[PDB]
Structure to design on (1197 residues):
């Protein structure tokens, strides 16, 4: 069916090169990766304590 | 005078340590560090008690060169363990 | 209580005995931490804020740490007790008795010496320094400067260029 | 939620709160005026020595 | 006191070891090149250490050319580390 | 250009952090020579005394007065 | 002199009560519940770990070479606790003649703690991995000295008390923008287990987590400050703790969010890439007090 | 070893300049260490099991030696105070100073490393450097020749020609013969230092040129007496005439340049009323000649080293000054009578 995993050179000239260099010079995407866990911290966890609460089952 | 009497005695112990060898080769380079350590105390006190200001930089330069011999001579120690099994003063071929 | 530097000088020699004697590079290596750390106090007591801490940074936290690698790189032989070995205990006991016999002669002031110089007491005269300087004080208070000694900076930089180039060429 | 996390932070707002306050509040009992003098260099060290000489006997830092 | 402050930490550290000890009853030479370069760089750091505490009384124009000079050669030593360092 | 334009975008693409190692360190040598501000900083460094000033005996001297505030010598008052 | 005990006992509690923070804050990152059964919110668990490991847990040494193995935790805990002494705080205990030189010295000697542990085991199997752990700490200490000097050359001498006074209106994060990014990464090398990871074994936990708080505080002196206020010690004590706690969250952020960088490519991030960057900024920080008047 | 090998060789050249132009006692310590870090790589070069043993023996006997010098430098702070390389002042400091210099030049009790280090070099270019390195600590001795006690300097000169005059007799290794030829000539070096400072530096001018010509004649590979034997008949025959001429000048013989230093060494010593010491110098000088005499029998006699393998192609070595300097090494007797004054 074909889907292709390779990007085949995202940077070409001037504008497309600098932003691909900016993420490697400092971080940016690591700070963006930091934000993924940041919002994940605030949302309520699905946890069941066994001696009081019980997990889902079936007939 | 009084403080110098002990570190001069400490210098002679480190001097004999260089001249003494029993099987191991690593002790000599350890004694080279100790010899430069004993010289560092002797140099500092003479400039600190009898003020110089300009000459107080000289033991700092001496501190740098102490490590130069204790690295470039220390690098040769590893080369013995590449040719032979382990470092030994007993293991020598030259006549 | 009376002496400050004189007590530390005895511990300085005490750590140095395991160098004339041969207690293996493991226990012999441990001596430089004991003699070095106490050896800073001998330097620090008369002054020198920068120069006193340079022993901790280079001699203790650089020199012997590289020596920690080489003990594992060459001659490890699994660390052994330094008491069971022949002549090692004999060199250790004779090493301390050369200095500890002089310690007994410190009492009643004057002590016998191989050198021509006399020791006497020197407790208050041990420092032998007045106040003198106040603002930007001490000769070791401004210990190092790039000015005046311009030639020394070039050769030190040159010698440290040699070390990196040479050691890479040997291996 | 945060109501579980915050007691873990509040206990750190007590244990780490100690070294800051214990070093500061001790100057009331030890010194007269809640202050400890810094040595730095012999200029400030000599001023500490002459203050004890200027009718203080045992005290190092004392007013008048 | 500095001597009283240092010894209190070590004596309490030794006591924690005895608690666990007394109470209960029933190869590769490529690492070496990294270690050596640590020592040789730190000595250049040792020469470059005085900078914030030294530059107060001395002339700036005489120092500026000499202060940068040590850092330049510290980069030249790293430039020799680019011409085949190894697999490390 | 054969080296100016060609060896610029390739350096930004392959090993991009090496651009900063030459540009920042390079300008650190150029700036203290050309910019007219370095001369001011040298004057204040020499004007601030480390030790007590020495007194000279007065025998036909110009621009030297008493310790009180008067128009004598240099005395730095550069920028407030 | 009673204040020394008021800087060991609450500090040992801070390393103990980290066990709550190190898996509850880390827990909500991973959507799991941390401590809950033991205490009201798990406050009884940190002290319960001490009773488990110290008293009842026995020893089984590999060889026990006379002095070693029972000397390495003394060097581990001793050097970690002595680092608290030169700290400026609102007021420091026995202020040194030069501050940061004592800070870099006791951290460089803290390399021995992982060195003597490698010599404790008789086997060759452990020492190769032990020397690799030394390489993680020894290499980053080269740059740690450089980035320190660039902050110092901007303003102030080596004394830690002068570093608070220079930050009166604005933080040092803004003038040292790329240098502040370095201290987030370089501190994690000292056995934090976030970019790279390797009875008496329990004592190493009490020493390694102690250095984590130590690097959090030391970053909050070199880069943070906000206000001084000598007349009011109340305002400084509360404001300093919040700033240090926010950096403690970022230390546990890297541990959960990001995988290990490999040992070989740890020497490609540093040395190959970081050392040319740090020295170029060091070259820049030499020129700064000369270009514009900035001398303490 | 590409371009940077010249830079490594340049730091030895620059290292001696630091020793030459100096006023500070710690500056010469830097100057000695400039040589320490720069000779070892050329001592290794190809990396051999014999080269590893030689370089470690070269390091340990010389680094500890310079460390004794630093003690005498620090005694110059305890006593006399000033950091100047003019006088040694203290007799206590001179005892550790002269012995540190003896570890590099005196040789009489410190020769032990020389025959093993000189043999251990895999290349002919490394042989020149050890004969050139001896120039560096001679500059130190020329500065502090007064105050130092002559009783324990002249013993380092008398005993050195004795051990040098016996230590080459049981040696067939060509590098080893030249190693003991150093110690034999070093006795003449540590004899003019108490008696008139001039001509001591001219002794170096004669020696260094004579030794540099010697090893450059061994650019056609030879390591033993039997390997230098096959040179007259199989290899170039006219080349061995220059080897003969240089070896004859190495010993004390009048129509050659090598006798011209031996002139003033005795001449200045006899002026200081000493006759019993220069007599002992002349008799021990005969023992030096014997090594060169046996080595000239590889050039004069037949000795039968023909071999099956023969060379037809022309030899092209380095030869920096292997044509201009042997002419000065063969004949300079009439050329240099008043030249003693020109050097110093």
């Amino acid at each position: 069916t074909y889907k292709y995993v390779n990007l085949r050179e995202p940077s070409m000239d001037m504008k497309s090169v600098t932003d691909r260099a900016a993420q490697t010079l400092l971080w940016t995407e690591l700070i963006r990766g930091l934000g993924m866990t940041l919002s994940y911290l605030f949302r309520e966890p699905a946890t069941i304590n066994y001696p009081f609460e019980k997990g889902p089952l079936s007939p | 005078s009084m403080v110098y009497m002990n570190i001069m005695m400490a210098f002679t112990v480190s001097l004999v340590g260089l001249l003494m060898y029993r099987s191991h080769l690593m002790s000599s380079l350890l004694c080279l560090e100790g010899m430069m350590l004993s010289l560092f105390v002797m140099a500092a006190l003479t400039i600190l008690n009898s003020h110089f200001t300009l000459a107080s930089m000289m033991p700092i330069i001496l501190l740098v060169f102490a490590a130069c011999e204790a690295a470039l001579g220390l690098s040769l120690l590893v080369m013995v363990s590449n040719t032979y099994g382990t470092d030994y003063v007993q293991n020598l071929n030259l006549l | 209580m009376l002496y400050i530097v004189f007590i530390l000088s005895v511990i300085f020699v005490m750590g140095f005995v395991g160098f004339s004697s041969k207690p293996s590079p493991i226990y012999g290596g441990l001596g430089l931490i004991v003699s070095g750390g106490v050896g800073c106090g001998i330097v620090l007591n008369f002054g020198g804020s920068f120069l006193g801490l340079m022993v901790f940074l280079i001699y203790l936290g650089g020199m012997m740490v590289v020596f920690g690698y080489t003990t594992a790189m060459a001659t490890e032989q699994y660390p052994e007790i330094w008491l069971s070995n022949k002549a090692v205990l004999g060199a250790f006991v004779t090493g301390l008795l050369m200095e500890f016999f002089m310690v007994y002669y410190v009492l009643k002031d004057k002590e016998v010496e191989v050198v021509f110089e006399f020791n006497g007491l020197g407790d208050w005269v041990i420092y032998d320094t007045g106040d003198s300087g106040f603002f930007s004080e001490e000769a070791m208070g401004i210990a190092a400067l790039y000015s005046y000694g311009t030639w020394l900076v070039i050769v030190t930089g040159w010698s440290l260029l040699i070390g990196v180039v040479v050691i890479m060429e040997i291996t | 939620m945060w109501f579980e996390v915050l007691p873990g932070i509040a206990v750190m707002g007590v244990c780490l709160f100690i070294p800051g306050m214990a070093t500061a509040r001790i100057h009331r009992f030890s010194n007269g005026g809640k202050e400890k003098r810094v040595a730095h260099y012999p200029y400030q060290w000599y001023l500490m020595e002459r203050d004890r000489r200027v009718s203080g006997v045992n005290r190092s830092y004392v007013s008048k | 006191n500095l001597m009283l402050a240092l010894l209190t930490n070590f004596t309490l550290a030794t006591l924690l070891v005895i608690i666990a000890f007394w109470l209960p009853q029933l190869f590769s030479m490529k690492f070496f090149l990294v270690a050596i370069t640590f020592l040789l760089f730190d000595l250049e750091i040792a020469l470059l250490l005085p900078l914030p505490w030294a530059s107060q009384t001395a002339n700036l124009n005489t120092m500026l050319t000499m202060a940068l000079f040590l850092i330049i050669l510290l980069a030249v030593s790293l430039a020799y580390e680019w011409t085949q360092k190894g697999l490390e | 250009a054969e080296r100016v334009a060609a060896f610029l975008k390739n350096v930004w693409a392959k090993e991009p952090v090496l651009v900063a190692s030459f540009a920042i360190a390079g300008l650190a040598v150029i700036l203290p020579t050309l910019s007219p501000y370095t001369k001011y900083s040298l004057m204040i460094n020499x004007x601030x005394x480390x030790x007590x000033x020495x007194x000279x005996x007065x025998x036909x001297x110009x621009x030297x007065x008493x310790x009180x505030x008067x128009x004598x010598x240099x005395x730095x008052x550069x920028x407030x | 002199m009673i204040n020394i005990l008021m800087l060991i006992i609450p500090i040992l509690l801070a390393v103990a009560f980290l066990t709550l923070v190190e898996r509850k804050v880390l827990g909500y990152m991973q959507l799991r519940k941390g401590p809950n059964v033991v205490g009201p919110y798990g406050l009884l668990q940190p002290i319960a770990d001490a009773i488990k490991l110290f008293i009842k847990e026995p020893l089984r040494p590999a060889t026990s070479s006379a002095s070693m193995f029972i000397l390495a935790p003394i060097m581990a805990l001793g050097l970690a606790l002595t680092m608290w002494i030169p700290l400026p705080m609102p007021y420091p205990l026995i202020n040194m003649n030069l501050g940061v030189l004592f800070m870099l010295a006791m951290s460089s000697l803290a390399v021995y703690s992982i060195l003597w542990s490698g010599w404790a085991s008789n086997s060759k199997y452990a020492l190769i991995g032990a020397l690799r752990a030394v390489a993680q700490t020894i290499s980053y200490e080269v740059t740690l000295a450089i980035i320190l000097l660039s902050v110092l050359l901007m303003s102030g001498s080596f004394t830690l008390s002068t570093l608070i006074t220079t930050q009166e209106q604005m933080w040092l994060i803004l003038p040292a923008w790329p240098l502040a990014m370095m201290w987030f990464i370089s501190t994690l090398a000292e056995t934090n287990r976030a970019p790279f990871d390797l009875g008496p074994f329990a004592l190493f936990f009490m020493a390694e987590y102690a250095n984590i708080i130590m690097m959090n505080i030391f970053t909050a002196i070199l880069f943070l400050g906000t206000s001084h206020n000598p007349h009011m010690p109340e305002l400084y004590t509360i404001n300093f703790t919040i700033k240090s706690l926010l950096l403690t969250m970022s230390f546990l952020w890297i541990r959960a969010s990001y995988p290990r960088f490999r040992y070989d490519q740890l020497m490609h991030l540093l040395w190959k890439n970081f050392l040319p960057l740090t020295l170029a900024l060091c070259m820049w920080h030499v020129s700064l007090p000369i270009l514009t008047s900035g001398i303490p | 070893n590409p371009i940077i090998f010249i830079i490594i060789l340049l730091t030895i050249m620059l290292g001696t300049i630091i020793v030459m132009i100096s006023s500070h006692w710690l500056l010469v310590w830097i100057g000695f260490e400039m040589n320490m870090l720069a000779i070892i790589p050329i001592m290794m070069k190809n990396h051999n099991p014999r080269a590893t043993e030689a370089s470690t023996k070269y390091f340990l006997t010389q680094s500890t030696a310079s460390m004794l010098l630093m003690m005498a430098v620090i005694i110059n702070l305890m006593f006399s105070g000033q950091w100047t390389v003019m006088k040694l002042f203290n007799p206590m400091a001179s005892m550790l100073m002269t012995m540190a210099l003896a570890m590099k030049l005196g040789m009489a009790p410190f020769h032990f490393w020389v025959p093993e280090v000189t043999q251990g070099i895999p290349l002919s270019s490394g042989l020149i450097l050890l004969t050139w390195q001896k120039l560096a600590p001679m500059s130190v001795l020329y500065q502090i020749f007064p105050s130092i006690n002559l009783n324990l300097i002249l013993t380092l000169s008398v005993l050195s020609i004795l051990i040098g005059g016996w230590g080459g007799l049981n040696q067939t290794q060509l590098r080893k013969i030249m190693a003991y030829s150093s110690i034999a000539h070093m006795g003449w070096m540590t004899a003019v230092l108490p008696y008139n400072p001039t001509m001591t530096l001219l002794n170096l001018i004669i020696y260094i040129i004579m030794t540099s010509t010697m090893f450059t004649m061994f650019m056609a590979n030879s390591t033993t007496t039997t390997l230098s034997l096959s040179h007259t008949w199989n290899k170039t025959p006219i080349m061995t005439v220059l080897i003969l001429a240089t070896l004859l000048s190495m010993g004390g013989l009048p129509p050659l340049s090598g006798f011209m230093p031996k002139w003033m060494i005795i001449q200045e010593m006899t002026k200081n009323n000493s006759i019993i010491l220069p007599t002992f110098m002349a008799i021990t000088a005969l023992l030096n000649l014997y090594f060169y005499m046996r080595l000239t029998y590889s050039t004069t006699l037949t000795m039968f080293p023909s071999t099956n393998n023969m060379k037809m192609k022309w030899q092209f070595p380095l030869m920096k000054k292997m044509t201009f300097l042997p002419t000065m090494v063969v004949l300079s007797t009439m050329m240099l009578p008043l030249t003693p004054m020109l050097s110093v």
Remarks:
- The longest helix of chain H spans residues 49-78.
- The radius of gyration of chain H is 20 Å.
- Chains H and A do not touch (no CB pair under 8 Å).
